[PDB]
């Protein structure tokens, strides 16, 4: 990629999240949102590396510190929506056009570290919290569908989670060094979701994951993403590990909850990114893996290889980009890569 533009938000507070809106239809402008402090800002990408301000939101709660955001749409009107959350522990659903909070969800006993929308049903929002649990909400009926935690749930803050491509299961990870699998295509979860639509509510309490392991990393796991049936996760050892539950030949949907084996297929090494809450991202087609480090360098790996050790790694740098890159986001068409930093700076890279 080639560096084409950069800007710094006037509040000068660290930015933690960034997400292009992958719901926009072909031909419509590529838009992304940034979040940090009590701010949520929307931008539109144009020619000649232009980054146009589209709308902005400033929470009345000056002490809020948004950590992440996720896009969806109101299925009743096909209108885009943006969910945001952070240290306050409240989920806010914002209308990106009027920048008004239309709904909010409280329940988590503490900060929310990550939000993810189901890849098929736009109403299903997953939140992971410092309170050790994951929560699934139906934002159409404003109901808490299920709480994932308890007897075999996480024992420390949940830092990240991700639905697989088809939205049949979730993998979570956190400060207890573990990675846990939660299937949501079970008769129980399908039924809970179904009844949540009927409400005009008793949520499901899921205490037992379908798989759990603490043998991948030796410290906090601050980011996890599905790579097909494989898993990509990182800790603070300057490496993203690619692994899978069970043995080399085990099928992800055939492994039992008591499976004790794991198979590491390789890793993507980098440097100077050992501070906590530094997230990696992939493009929609999952052909590229990206991760920024604490000194402004942006690593990009080509995933279309037979093994991670043979994946070409491109290091993107700009002599003026020296702040920690908390998160990056590819446009749906992989043509643009945006990075946000701890100094409120935003960097635009257009595809090579």
């Amino acid at each position: 990629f080639k560096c084409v533009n950069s800007l710094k938000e006037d509040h000068n507070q660290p930015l933690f999240g960034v997400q292009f809106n992958w719901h926009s239809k072909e031909g419509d402008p590529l838009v992304f949102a940034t979040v940090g402090s009590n701010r949520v800002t929307l931008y539109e990408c144009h020619s000649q590396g232009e980054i146009r301000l589209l709308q902005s939101y400033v929470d009345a709660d000056a002490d809020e510190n948004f950590y992440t955001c996720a896009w969806t749409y109101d299925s009743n009107t096909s209108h885009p929506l943006l969910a945001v959350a952070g240290s306050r522990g409240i989920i806010r659903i914002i209308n990106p056009i009027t920048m008004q909070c239309i709904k909010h969800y409280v329940g988590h006993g503490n900060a929310i570290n990550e939000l993810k929308f189901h890849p098929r049903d736009p109403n299903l929002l997953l939140s992971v919290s410092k309170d050790h649990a994951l929560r699934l909400w139906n934002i159409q009926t404003d109901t808490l569908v299920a709480i994932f935690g308890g007897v075999e749930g996480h024992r420390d803050e949940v830092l990240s989670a991700d639905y697989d491509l088809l939205g049949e299961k979730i993998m979570s990870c956190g400060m207890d060094h573990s990675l846990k699998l939660w299937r949501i295509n079970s008769k129980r979860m399908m039924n809970a979701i179904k009844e949540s639509y009927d409400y005009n509510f008793i949520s499901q309490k899921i205490h037992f994951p379908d798989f759990s392991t603490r043998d991948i990393h030796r410290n906090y796991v601050d980011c996890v993403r599905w790579l097909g049936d494989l898993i990509l996760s990182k800790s603070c050892e300057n490496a993203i590990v690619c692994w899978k539950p069970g043995k080399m030949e085990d099928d992800i949907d055939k492994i039992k909850p008591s499976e004790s084996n794991v198979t590491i297929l390789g890793r993507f090494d980098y440097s100077q990114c050992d501070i906590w809450y530094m997230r990696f991202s992939m493009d929609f087609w999952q052909k590229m893996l990206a991760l920024g480090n604490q000194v402004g360098k942006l690593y990009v790996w080509d995933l279309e290889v037979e093994d991670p050790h043979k994946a070409k790694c491109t290091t993107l740098t700009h002599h003026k980009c020296g702040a920690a890159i908390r998160q990056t986001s590819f446009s749906r068409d992989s043509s643009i890569l945006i990075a946000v930093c701890d100094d409120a700076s935003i960097w635009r890279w257009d595809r090579l």
């Binding site: 719901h23 926009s24 885009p80 491509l165 494989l230 087609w285 279309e304």
Partner: peptide
């Protein structure tokens, strides 16, 4: 070869997601 074979699932599943996306007409922000 496991990593390579996994790529097939990715291609098929991202295609499914892309097809559902093609059906939508979400209003632009």
């Amino acid at each position: 070869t496991m990593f390579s074979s996994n790529r097939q699932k990715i291609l098929e599943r991202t295609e499914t997601l892309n097809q559902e996306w093609k059906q939508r007409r979400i209003q632009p922000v």
